[PDB]
Design an enzyme around this catalytic site. Structure first.
Site, PDB file in Angstrom:
ATOM      1  N   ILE A   1       0.841  -1.188   0.000  1.00 32.96           N
ATOM      2  CA  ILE A   1       0.000   0.000   0.000  1.00 32.96           C
ATOM      3  C   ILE A   1       0.878   1.240   0.000  1.00 32.96           C
ATOM      4  O   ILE A   1       1.879   1.305   0.720  1.00 32.96           O
ATOM      5  CB  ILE A   1      -0.942  -0.007   1.210  1.00 32.96           C
ATOM      6  CG1 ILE A   1      -1.701  -1.326   1.228  1.00 32.96           C
ATOM      7  CG2 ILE A   1      -1.897   1.173   1.161  1.00 32.96           C
ATOM      8  CD1 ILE A   1      -2.387  -1.592   2.512  1.00 32.96           C
ATOM      9  N   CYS A   2       0.515   2.209  -0.834  1.00 34.86           N
ATOM     10  CA  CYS A   2       1.096   3.547  -0.787  1.00 34.86           C
ATOM     11  C   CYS A   2       0.157   4.428   0.039  1.00 34.86           C
ATOM     12  O   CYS A   2      -0.930   4.806  -0.419  1.00 34.86           O
ATOM     13  CB  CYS A   2       1.319   4.099  -2.191  1.00 34.86           C
ATOM     14  SG  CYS A   2       2.741   3.357  -3.010  1.00 34.86           S
ATOM     15  N   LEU A   3       0.569   4.730   1.267  1.00 32.68           N
ATOM     16  CA  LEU A   3      -0.209   5.554   2.181  1.00 32.68           C
ATOM     17  C   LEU A   3       0.741   6.532   2.844  1.00 32.68           C
ATOM     18  O   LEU A   3       1.743   6.111   3.429  1.00 32.68           O
ATOM     19  CB  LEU A   3      -0.910   4.694   3.235  1.00 32.68           C
ATOM     20  CG  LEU A   3      -1.758   5.411   4.283  1.00 32.68           C
ATOM     21  CD1 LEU A   3      -2.886   6.204   3.617  1.00 32.68           C
ATOM     22  CD2 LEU A   3      -2.310   4.380   5.263  1.00 32.68           C
TER      23      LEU A   3
END
Length: 152
Positions: free
Chosen positions: A88-90
């Site tokens: 995930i890109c968060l």
């Protein structure tokens, strides 16, 4: 466990999640390793991900809570900011982590991300393209993975 500040804090994260979970999230340490958690996020209501039940894993180090854990979807996902391997890109996981965030706030942040993709991190290029250009087809793809999330 209780031998380190990270472990005691994780147990406090777990207590908060047991007795006062945010809507649609759950998480627990793995039976044998408090550093590795299993979590579930329900897709936010009023979004294409509504009714989805998505499993994730979260891996901590002893630097927690001063370093964010690594979070991956285990369930299949179709989202501009989620890689094919579940990564995930968060932003709170990559750029603006704060030791005040816990398992609960990470899970709600990912939940919010499902509703509102970040256009800066197109980890899934087809998902970003459909999100940008064809919302109906994007949501058809999301509906598929919502339905798949009912199967482990």
């Amino acid at each position: 466990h209780m031998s380190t500040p990270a472990r005691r804090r994780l147990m406090r994260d777990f207590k908060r999640l047991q007795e006062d979970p945010p809507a649609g999230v759950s998480g627990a340490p793995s039976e044998n390793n408090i550093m590795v958690w299993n979590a579930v996020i329900f897709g936010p209501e009023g979004t294409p991900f509504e009714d989805g039940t998505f499993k994730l894993t979260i891996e901590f180090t002893e630097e927690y809570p001063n370093k964010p854990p690594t979070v991956r979807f285990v369930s299949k996902m179709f989202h501009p900011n989620v890689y094919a391997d579940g990564s995930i890109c968060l932003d709170i996981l990559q750029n603006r982590w704060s030791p005040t965030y816990d398992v609960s706030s990470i899970l709600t942040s990912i939940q919010s991300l499902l509703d509102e993709p970040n256009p800066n991190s197109p980890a899934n290029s087809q998902a970003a393209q459909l999100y940008q250009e064809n919302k109906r087809e994007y949501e058809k793809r999301v509906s598929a993975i919502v339905e798949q999330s009912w199967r482990d």
